[PDB]
Amino acid sequence: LRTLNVKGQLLTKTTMSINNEDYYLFKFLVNNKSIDYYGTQTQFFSLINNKTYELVLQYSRKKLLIKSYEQCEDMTVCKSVTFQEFCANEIKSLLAKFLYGFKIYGSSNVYKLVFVILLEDNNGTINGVQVEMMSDFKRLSGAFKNHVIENENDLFDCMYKSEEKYFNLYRIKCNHNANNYKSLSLSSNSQLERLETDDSMFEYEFQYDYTVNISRSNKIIQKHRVTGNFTSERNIYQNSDRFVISYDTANEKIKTSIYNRMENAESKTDYDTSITLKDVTLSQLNSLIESNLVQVDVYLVTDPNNVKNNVIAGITKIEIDGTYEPL
DNA sequence: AAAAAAAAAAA
């Protein structure tokens, strides 16, 4: 059959079993595009992650296949980013400081990661800003280079031991919505590499101090270790339906809300059951905190000026076994 | 069929 000659960097290898047949597929980075190819078990085992290859491909059974490969060999990340590079929705490689990582409250699959980057005004000044990057479990598992994320506990463990550490963000997409909200996005070929600096880059720590979160409007995200009197009531108002929450961080009493809205494709019975399970699990949280059975972190969308529209972005339970439960 | 921030409610 006809053969295709390509060259590209491997990103991940996956095994999917469907209708009692196993398929080994490799995600390769060719010309800054993620292309999925098929292969055999020898391909699955011999090929290594994050390495370029010279591949020959045969088009068999309506599927591009890998026949032979040659292990070849081959980056620079921008230390900043401009407003216009966010406006154009460009694709960049940044140097960011990881801050927090949590599972969006009430979301089954999506996670949110908080970074500190250097934005640049048209005035030509670089300010360390706080940015949010949402993703799913699959992309987040396949994005951390040199880290094997199998289940959710591994993802949270990587998140917690990557906290306040520097990351090269390869081929991330700089979103910009209709309103002036700028976020980060994780594409198929996007990768996240942890530097393990050992504070080798410390003179720049002054630059990585934030006062504005550019993915939100005059709000930031802050992480609190609940040490005291957690409390959560539920209030169904005429329109809204929110958990009114108070708790006690080592510094401040905090008041907050978790707003509940029914999804379009969500039956009222399923929504009501899910919300009552959320309420039951929140009303048991203070009992677990007091008895030293869990340690709770709350990631909070706080307004630095007026604390009257606080919202809990996420909650994470660290259990005494070491397991992480994303409340 | 965008999605995601912002939303004290209720007189």
Identify whether residues A261 and A184 lie together within a single domain. Answer: no
Residue A185 placed within a domain: yes
* Distance measured from the CA of protein residue A238 to the C1' of nucleotide B10, in angstroms: 9
A308 nearest nucleotide via C1' and CA: B8
Identify whether residues A86 and A153 lie together within a single domain. Answer: yes
User: Resolution of the experimental model in angstroms, please?
Assistant: 3.1
A257 nearest nucleotide via C1' and CA: B8
**Cα A86 to Cα A105: distance, rounded to the nearest angstrom:** 27
Positions in chain B where some atom is under 7 Å from a protein CB: 2-10
* Distance measured from the CA of protein residue A249 to the C1' of nucleotide B8, in angstroms: 22
Identify whether residues A210 and A229 lie together within a single domain. Answer: no
Residue A75 placed within a domain: no
Identify whether residues A103 and A197 lie together within a single domain. Answer: yes
* Distance measured from the CA of protein residue A215 to the C1' of nucleotide B5, in angstroms: 8
What method did the depositors use to determine the structure? cryo-EM
Identify whether residues A129 and A197 lie together within a single domain. Answer: yes
Identify whether residues A30 and A124 lie together within a single domain. Answer: no
* Distance measured from the CA of protein residue A264 to the C1' of nucleotide B1, in angstroms: 11
* Distance measured from the CA of protein residue A134 to the C1' of nucleotide B1, in angstroms: 21
**Cα A29 to Cα A23: distance, rounded to the nearest angstrom:** 20
The number of folded domains in chain A is 3
Q: Which residue is nearest to nucleotide B2 (CA to C1')?
A: A177
CATH number at residue A184: 2.40.50.140
